[PDB]
Amino acid sequence: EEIFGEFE
Amino acid sequence: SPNYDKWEMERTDITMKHKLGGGEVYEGVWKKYSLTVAVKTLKEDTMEVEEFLKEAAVMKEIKHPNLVQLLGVCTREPPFYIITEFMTYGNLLDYLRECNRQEVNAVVLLYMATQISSAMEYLEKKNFIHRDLAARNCLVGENHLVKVADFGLSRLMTGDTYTAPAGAKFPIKWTAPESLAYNKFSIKSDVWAFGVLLWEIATYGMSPYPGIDLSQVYELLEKDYRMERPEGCPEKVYELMRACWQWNPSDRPSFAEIHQAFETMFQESSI
Ligand SMILES: Nc1ncnc2c1ncn2[C@@H]1O[C@H](COP(=O)(O)OP(=O)(O)O)[C@@H](O)[C@H]1O
């Protein structure tokens, strides 16, 4: 899956 | 203890052997000692010379038996290298997945946690934060030796709270609430992560909050949701994960108390 990402 | 200078390595003392990672990391052989070393390389054209080099500087400062050792750097001409000790078995996450669950008993596991908890107590005292603690950044050696590595986001630190440059993207499931929301990292961020890194290890390499999406993690931590006790995981060690996952960073144990919990086979204070 995808690890990194930004929060909102 | 390098060649012709304190940390300066002539591009000549190293004999590159072959790619290992994607910004490129090779395996090489450092002549003066015929030691096999790992060599991290910089993408020849990206305003990193400053940034990239900061990593090799955080390292010159620390020296612990469970923290991957810096052995030298190449700066005077490109490409820019950073040389460190080699760790034959690679990252812990991978190792755990592939490994044989017989040779890796629940004690070898405990052994790994203790090794890491130890590198953190040390880092805690030197007052350093490892802004990206997780299995994929731990390396392995002979007989299950584990070493923490990947000090890219690593910061020394004056005050007790670092504000990550705004507009960033970080590993959600390993990042703590006060960081996911206010881009503020602390030695308590690591404690939160460490709590995940124990879940990783206990589940022999699974992906955190399994089946749950990245967007749903935070709002779920707010409603007080936490992962459940991994199978075969001693209630004593789970109990310690929860400690690390306290909403208020102030209620989280310290690495010093954490290491004590392990090193003592459990005969010390997080309750
Ligand atoms: N000191 C080391 N010894 C052995 N392998 C290393 C060492 N340092 C880094 N590596 C390897 O370099 C690879 C680099 O991966 P990378 O491209 O930087 O992103 P990622 O770790 O997410 O795959 C890692 O898979 C790791 O196994």
Numbering used by the authors:
A (entry chain C): 104 to 111
B (entry chain A): 229 to 250, 254 to 502
Source paper text:
BCR–Abl is a constitutively activated form of the nonreceptor tyrosine kinase c-Abl. The improper activation of the Abl tyrosine kinase results in chronic myeloid leukemia (CML). The recognition of an inactive conformation of Abl, in which a catalytically important Asp-Phe-Gly (DFG) motif is flipped by approximately 180° with respect to the active conformation, underlies the specificity of the cancer drug imatinib, which is used to treat CML. Our results suggest that interconversion between distinctly different inactive conformations is a characteristic feature of the Abl kinase domain.
The other structures include active and various inactive conformations that suggest how the kinase domain might convert between the αC-Glu In and αC-Glu Out conformations. (C) Active Abl (molecule C, structure 2). (D) In cells the active conformation of Abl undergoes rapid autophosphorylation that is expected to trap the protein in the active conformation (indicated as C*).
